[PDB]
Amino acid sequence: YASSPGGVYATRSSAVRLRSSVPGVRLLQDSVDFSLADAINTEFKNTRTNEK
Amino acid sequence: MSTRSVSSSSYRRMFGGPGTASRPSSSRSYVTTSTRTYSLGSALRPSTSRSL
Numbered sequence A: 001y002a003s004s005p006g007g008v009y010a011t012r013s014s015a016v017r018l019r020s021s022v023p024g025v026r027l028l029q030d031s032v033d034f035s036l037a038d039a040i041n042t043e044f045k046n047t048r049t050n051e052k
Numbered sequence B: 001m002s003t004r005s006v007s008s009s010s011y012r013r014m015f016g017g018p019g020t021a022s023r024p025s026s027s028r029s030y031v032t033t034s035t036r037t038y039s040l041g042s043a044l045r046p047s048t049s050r051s052l
Helices: A035-051
Strands: none
């Protein structure tokens, strides 16, 4: 037998990484969150440690 | 990334302040006039001895 590991296409997130307009006219509203999305990346680590 | 930074431009029109309707500064920064009138109070009674 020969199982392929192909299909693992990691999507590079490419957020603008610049605050509103030039150096900004707002600051509070930039969505402090994304350590949620990296804690969901460890949820999908522990989900695959579960699922398998 | 946004923020909740307040976005005031000029934002309530643009025209200066309320603010100077140019109240006319009349030229009473001149000197008040010289009231130099004169009374010829003497020659108007031609006081001469015709007894000659």
